[PDB]
Design a protein around this ligand. Sequence first.
Ligand code: NAG
Ligand code: ACH
Lengths: 100, 47, 47, 55, 109, 109
Amino acid sequence: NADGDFAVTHLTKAHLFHDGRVQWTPPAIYKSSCSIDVTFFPFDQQNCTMKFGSWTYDKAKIDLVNMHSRVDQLDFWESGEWVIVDAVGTYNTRKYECCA
Amino acid sequence: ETRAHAEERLLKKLFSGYNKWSRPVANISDVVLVRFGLSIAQLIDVD
Amino acid sequence: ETRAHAEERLLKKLFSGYNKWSRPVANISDVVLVRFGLSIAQLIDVD
Amino acid sequence: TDTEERLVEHLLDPSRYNKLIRPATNGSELVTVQLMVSLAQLISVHEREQIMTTN
Amino acid sequence: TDTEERLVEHLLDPSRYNKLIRPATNGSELVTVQLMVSLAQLISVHEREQIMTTNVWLTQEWEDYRLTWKPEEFDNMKKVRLPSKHIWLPDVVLYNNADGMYEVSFYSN
Amino acid sequence: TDTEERLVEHLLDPSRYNKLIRPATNGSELVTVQLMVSLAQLISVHEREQIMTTNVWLTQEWEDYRLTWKPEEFDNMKKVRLPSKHIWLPDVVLYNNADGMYEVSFYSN
Ligand SMILES: *[C@@H]1O[C@H](CO)[C@@H](O)[C@H](O)[C@H]1NC(C)=O
Ligand SMILES: CC(=O)OCC[N+](C)(C)C
């Protein structure tokens, strides 16, 4: 995060099913930092990333699953300035000095 | 008989002994699998 | 005898059966006359 | 009025009116919502940032 | 400490204290509020729109006779912290403000 | 888990736990807070307005004797997650902030 919120703040309603499934799809505006390479500007290609994860639950308590590798663009409002070439999520694990 | 009344009964039962601060697993060794995905509405700005 | 005890009694009595969502008229046909006025503290900007 | 406050207390009584629940009847029937937009003012169009502001 | 919990629960007991009542005894006496502004920093002066921004502490002192206790009955405690939302306050604010922000920032203890 | 939620209800019960009171025993003893800053990113340095913007993780560690339990009574549970808005916190803030934002951004468990 960079100049924005860390977590979701809108808190829409969740959709609860009878077998215990919970579906929650809130909107969010994120301002994330990404290093910008302008070697070939204005013919440049930028590669900006977004890292999401649980803050206080480790892998033994909460684990993430890719709903689908590619970012969904069925409802995407075209910008007119940039075109998305590729948007894919990668699953990672790792240890921090904070926590065991 | 109306769907609203049945939903009211269901809401009364579901949250009777519910704790929103506790991880929702039957067994402590269980893990909560969260299916996570992104859907982009628009690309507001690349500063 | 102290003003504070009288004020506490008054507050208890005023809001015992008071409903803030209902137009406060004794009779339904009555109109609530609201005296309205403005006092300008400063003209911040004219854009 | 005493009658009006009695009615408003009766209608919104949380014991028998839950505002979280759709006012649905006849089981799988749906609630019909009529929408109509009235435009009071077109405050501005900002071409640079591509935003329209309306009241 | 447990004594501090007991004291806090005793002072704010609603059966003997509600914040909506001014703490005036002797009929028509007034509450004397002592004000002292301390300047943390002069953030900026914007001459174009004629606005001065400052960071300050708005020290306020008054006497509320309803918040008294005997120290020997509470392990000799001489002072305690109460949330300012739960006690009567003087609603002292800045009148010549621009941007329409009157009140203090945080409402500390 | 049923045991976990029983424990969490027990710990955060406002009847027995008051989050506005410092977890000090024996009267005038003090609470020690361990502080460690981890720098995740230097976002910018604005020379014109003289502001440095940083993304940091502020480690805080302390003891609260009121938030203890016996593991044997709670299915050998050793630790739990509690919402930071419902327990006593030491109000450690960035004192020399610009823009008057003293607190942290997220308030995690
Ligand atoms: C973009 O960056 C990510 C992470 O550094 C990398 O996995 C990916 O291959 C990059 N894509 C391109 C086209 O360079
Ligand atoms: C336990 C806790 O608060 O961890 C925060 C830091 N993180 C996300 C790197 C583990």
